[PDB]
């Protein structure tokens, strides 16, 4: 818009879910220029909503593809393309440099922060209407990392949290507070939440909820709310016994709030969910122990309440189909009384579990929520790995 | 190529009555089957075509059906002169497959 | 524009046919990443004209364009492109996700709705200013279908026809009126007509003519005229003995206007015509059994008069080529004192006629009218099917 | 902007270096249409930066990259394309036709001049909003050359250095200051430099500062200060031991400010600097006989003291990786306090180092100052000669 943006509403009933965007990207990469890719995810400008992701600087096809299971190195990028076109070599743009991101746009113009860096001496750097303007050099010198997916700002400030340290064990999670590329300040990672890692975020009434994931000991997901005018926030978890994250051990009947479930340690996916008291929805890979399926519950109160078990669902992905990271994000310019609540699903596609080729790339799967009760199908990525030898 | 398949191959009815010949096809061919007529010692006369939609002036007492891989033409008040062959021919995806032919004796 | 568009004019004299686009993507997507498609189409905005269509989500020549025969999949997407360049990989928009479409403008900016799920559980998602408004489940649960070609609106009201049923018998076709992509009403079906499938729609003197098809037992096609300021509708059939539909029994000396013309039941081809008293011209495909040929004849009075044989022709297609789909477009914002008629005709490549390869693609040739007698050509899509051997 | 720019600023202070740009343009054209260039740089307009390189007129991968390991030739073209995306075939925008280059933009549109022409009788012609306004035939008539990075312009001008001439001796190095395309003067190379190629320029205070390369005789590399507003300039060297060209003789414990150093006689590289006072930084490959790895040093006062020695540094490209040519250029329209030093590396991949193919390619890396001390990676080139056969 040309002004900043409030988040002035709530979500709207969320009682089912309408496809909003589909890639086909590698059914598409197996003859055409596309980028192998991780890491996607969906933010929208006032203009336009785009597909984003984490390059890797080759294309499935070429030579160059092999060995992209390593998550960072300095040929990945943080990159963008129109809703639902395959991220083609001549229709991405670098968005910043680097192998963690998260990108937001204010209302006025957008903020991209690509981090990068060996694990030990690290930097994120924080663009501002396509220009750098802040970095931030490593805190706890063993892998800087963030979001994974769109920040959310309230008036001109953009809560980002970023996590430095370990994945197994204590690690320094800060929250930052920015407004327009600088630093307004920033805070550490305060409550019962044990470990944060991959927030996905959306914001309502003022507030922003983050879903994050607790790899050290985490099989319930915690969540930080940052009260984005006050500069705050706090961390709980999900006390439902509906188990979301993955691995994780079976759901129990009765959860815990304050505290990491026990059972699947040094582990986990990035993942989301919509809190809202009665209109909560969760979401959870179908299996417990791999990413395959991917599908939505409602379960009213899951924050809150700890023997919160799903009244209505929704199968997005099927359990004989990959999946892999989820996020939230909304199209928070979109004309209405409220906002529209929507996730995308990465599709891993490739190794290790598909080792036949050398190649990690994946697909993306969105979707909106509608009022009405619309019927389901599920949405497989599509290739046939044996198109490809 | 899709197999056509007829049988039997020789057919009697009496004048007046109703034959069926049936047709077969090898795989669904959906409903594109074509009859033809080869009256004795002539050329086929195209009969029917799409199963059931009879070409240009032949008379409505042939009547063809069909779904899948079964089709069947019928004859109704055979008159004497309906003695011919009588051939499907399979009109949906390259080559042009036709059937044995099938005799119509008159009783 | 920035207002709504209202049909004040009446259509153009039709003397004769001028080319107005050609695509030729099959012959180019030998060697170039084009989509494969089908279900093809032509809408324009205020600003530019351009080729819609249902891509399939992969290139000609990848290897999983094998089996693109079946029509409705999640892998299908209503895509869009310049004006007679190839739908390639690089220059296609993804419009929305789905297998069946319609798209119009309102003036303001446009409407697209694709319809998507499984046959028994679909739903329809209306799309304006590319975000989704309304969505639609569906009402009888078999195949919900629609338009396959540009809708029309007046005066921010655009009516779609949807059918949800058997395309062997009653199915439920209801005429939406839609505005700005909210639902003003919707009523069902009224009239002679028997079943309704794929409307070509075109509009003058506020009014909507749309001309469908009969799958039961229509040989002749069925016509929906649609007020859309009263928000009405009636339908008949188009009485003149020159049947349009394929394949279709021999054409009569009388024919039928208020019931379906008897002969080839459960089949048709999407198809269009003008109807303008004197100035009324007709299209059909030229060979009765197949998709071969497509022909245009003036046909004065074709609507209304029972025995109307054609006073004028042009061949379009040639018999020895193949033809497929075809649906009217006009440019509403074009400069003048009336509408130039102008009509688009798929030209379907592939399996199950052409079933060496095993891809069903199309290219697409467009035409508008001339009031002129200019002289005729014939325009084959042109490819060779034994190059992609 | 829509107004000349005047350089008000200073350079900030530089205390490390953040990635700002990055390529991989031979890695993702070993399977994709990607351009064979060399002699690349980075321009920013008010409103974007830009990666320009002289284009070979060939794909990597296409039989005709076969032998551009050679300089100059009717096919070499001024290309541009976006931020950090290969200069692939269907996004590289032609800025003018030659062999030598240099572009850059006054605030109001942008300068290019594209030089061409047989070694004996060569032309430059300087374009001005992408329409050539003047030209300049030679003057020496043996291989007319200029900057090959952007250009600086203050208020309307802008001073571009061109040599004609011998590149093994004496050769004519004039000064142009043009106005909008328009020669508004023109002097001879004043000073103690010895030989003038290949000036890399950035500007801050009203004035114009140009390192340059001695092919000559200078291992150290001579400067020259233009004031744009007075239209006069000086050439003296760099001071410091730390000598900065390649090949380069070991460097000494004193130096040499008023001649050129000796020991490499007849070669360079093109190179640049950043001369503040302290916040001075110098950079050189690493390698004295090649060239391979690059690194940026902190040595305050170089230009003036000559037993410079430096006090901080940082490793930009690895020296069991390859680097060539770099460049100077900053974002003049980023908002700020000051200017936002940063610089280019090119990365020549091919003959004759690795002649095992028979191309010469090249891939871009980009870094632009922090203040912050940001820890350090290298960036590599990325590819493997190997996949190529
Ligand atoms: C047209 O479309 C509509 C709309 O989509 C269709 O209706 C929808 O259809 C859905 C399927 O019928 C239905 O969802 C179901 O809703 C119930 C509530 O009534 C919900 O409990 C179901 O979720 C459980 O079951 C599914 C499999 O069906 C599991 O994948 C899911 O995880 C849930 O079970 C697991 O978690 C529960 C909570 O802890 C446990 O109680 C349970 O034991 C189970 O746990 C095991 O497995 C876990 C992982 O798989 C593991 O971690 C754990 O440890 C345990 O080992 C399901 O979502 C929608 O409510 C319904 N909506 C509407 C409006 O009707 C309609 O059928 C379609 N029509 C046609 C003709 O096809
Ligand atoms: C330069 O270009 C100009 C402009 O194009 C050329 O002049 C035009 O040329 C056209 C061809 O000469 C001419 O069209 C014809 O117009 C007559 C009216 O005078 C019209 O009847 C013709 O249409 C019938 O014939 C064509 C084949 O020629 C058929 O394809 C068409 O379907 C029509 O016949 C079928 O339907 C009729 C209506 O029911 C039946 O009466 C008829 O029996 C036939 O039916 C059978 O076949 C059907 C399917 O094919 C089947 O369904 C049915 O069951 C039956 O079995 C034809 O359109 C233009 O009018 C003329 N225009 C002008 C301004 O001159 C000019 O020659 C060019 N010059 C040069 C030098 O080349
Ligand atoms: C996280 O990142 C930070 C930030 O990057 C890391 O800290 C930085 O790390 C750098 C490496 O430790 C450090 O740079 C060094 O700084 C010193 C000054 O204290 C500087 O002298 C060093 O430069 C010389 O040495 C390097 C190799 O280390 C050479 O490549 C370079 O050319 C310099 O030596 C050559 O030139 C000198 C000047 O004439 C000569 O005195 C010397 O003899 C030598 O000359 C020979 O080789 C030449 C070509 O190679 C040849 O031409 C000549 O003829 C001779 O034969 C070096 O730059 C940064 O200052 C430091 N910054 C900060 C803020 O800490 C940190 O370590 C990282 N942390 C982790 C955990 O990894
Ligand atoms: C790139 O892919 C190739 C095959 O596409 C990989 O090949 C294997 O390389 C290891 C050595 O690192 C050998 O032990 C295997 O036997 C090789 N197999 C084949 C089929 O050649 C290769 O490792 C991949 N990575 C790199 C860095 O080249
Ligand atoms: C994809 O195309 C191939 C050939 O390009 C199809 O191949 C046939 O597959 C059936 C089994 O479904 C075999 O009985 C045939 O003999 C195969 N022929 C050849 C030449 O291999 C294949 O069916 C197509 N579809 C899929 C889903 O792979
Ligand atoms: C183009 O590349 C080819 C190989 O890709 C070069 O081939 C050599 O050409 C010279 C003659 O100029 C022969 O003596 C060598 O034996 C050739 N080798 C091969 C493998 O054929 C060729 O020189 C390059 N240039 C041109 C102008 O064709
Ligand atoms: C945004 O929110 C702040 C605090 O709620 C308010 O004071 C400001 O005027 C609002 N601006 C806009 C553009 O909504
Ligand atoms: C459009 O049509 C309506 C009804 O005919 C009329 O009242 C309205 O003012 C017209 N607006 C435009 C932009 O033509
Ligand atoms: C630019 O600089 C000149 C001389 O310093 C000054 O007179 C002129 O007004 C300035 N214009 C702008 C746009 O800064
Ligand atoms: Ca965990
Ligand atoms: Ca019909
Ligand atoms: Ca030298």
């Known amino acids: 818009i040309r002004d900043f943006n409030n988040l002035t509403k709530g979500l709207c009933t969320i009682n089912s879910w309408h496809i909003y965007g589909k890639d086909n990207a590698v059914r598409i990469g197996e003859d055409s220029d596309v980028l192998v890719t991780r890491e996607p995810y969906v933010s929208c400008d006032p203009d336009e909503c785009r597909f984003y992701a984490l390059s890797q600087g080759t294309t499935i096809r070429g030579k160059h593809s092999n060995g992209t299971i390593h998550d960072r190195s300095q040929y990945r990028a943080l990159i963008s393309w129109p809703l639902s076109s395959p991220p083609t070599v001549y229709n991405s743009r670098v968005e910043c440099i680097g192998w963690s991101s998260t990108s937001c746009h204010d209302g006025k113009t957008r903020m991209s922060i690509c981090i990068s860096g060996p694990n030990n001496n690290a930097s994120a750097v924080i663009w501002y209407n396509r220009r750098p303007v802040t970095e931030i050099n490593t805190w706890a010198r063993n892998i800087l990392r963030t979001q994974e997916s769109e920040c959310v700002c309230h008036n001109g400030v953009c809560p980002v949290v970023f996590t430095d340290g370990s994945a197994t064990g204590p690690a320094e999670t800060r929250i930052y507070y920015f407004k327009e590329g600088k630093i307004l300040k920033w805070e550490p990672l305060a409550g019962t939440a044990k470990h944060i890692e991959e927030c996905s975020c959306y914001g309502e009434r003022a507030e922003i909820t983050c879903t994050c994931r607790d790899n050290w000991q985490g099989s319930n997901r915690p969540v930080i709310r940052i009260d984005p005018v006050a500069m705050t926030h706090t961390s709980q978890y999900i006390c439902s016994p509906v188990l979301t994250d993955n691995p994780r051990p079976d759901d129990p009947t009765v959860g815990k709030c304050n505290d990491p479930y026990p059972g699947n340690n040094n582990n986990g996916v990035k993942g989301f969910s919509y809190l809202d008291g009665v209109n909560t929805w969760l979401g959870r890979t179908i299996s417990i122990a791999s990413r395959s399926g991917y599908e939505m519950l409602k379960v009213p109160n899951a924050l809150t309440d700890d023997k919160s078990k799903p009244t209505q669902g929704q199968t997005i992905v099927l359990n004989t189909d990959w999946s892999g990271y989820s996020g939230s994000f909304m199209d928070y310019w979109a004309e209405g009384e409220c906002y529209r609540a929507c996730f995308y699903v990465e599709l891993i596609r490739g190794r290790p579990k598909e080792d036949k080729v050398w190649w990690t790339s994946n697909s993306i799967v969105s979707m909106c929520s509608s009022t009405e009760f619309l019927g389901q199908w599920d949405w497989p990525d599509g290739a046939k790995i044996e198109y490809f030898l | ?107």
Chains 1, 3, 4 share one sequence.
Not at chain 2, 35 to 61: C, E, F, M, N
Not at chain 2, 71 to 82: G, K, N, P
């Open chain 2, 1 to 107: 190529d899709i197999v056509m398949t007829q049988s039997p191959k020789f057919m009697s009815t009496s004048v007046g009555d109703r034959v069926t010949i049936t047709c077969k096809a090898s795989q669904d061919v959906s409903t594109a089957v074509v009859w033809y007529q080869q009256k004795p010692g002539q050329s086929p006369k195209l009969l029917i075509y799409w199963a059931s939609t009879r070409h240009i002036g032949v008379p409505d007492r042939f009547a063809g059906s069909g779904s899948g891989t079964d089709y069947t033409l019928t004859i109704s008040s055979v008159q004497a002169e309906d003695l011919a062959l009588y051939y499907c021919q399979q009109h949906y995806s390259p080559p042009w497959t036709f059937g044995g032919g099938t005799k119509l004796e008159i009783k």
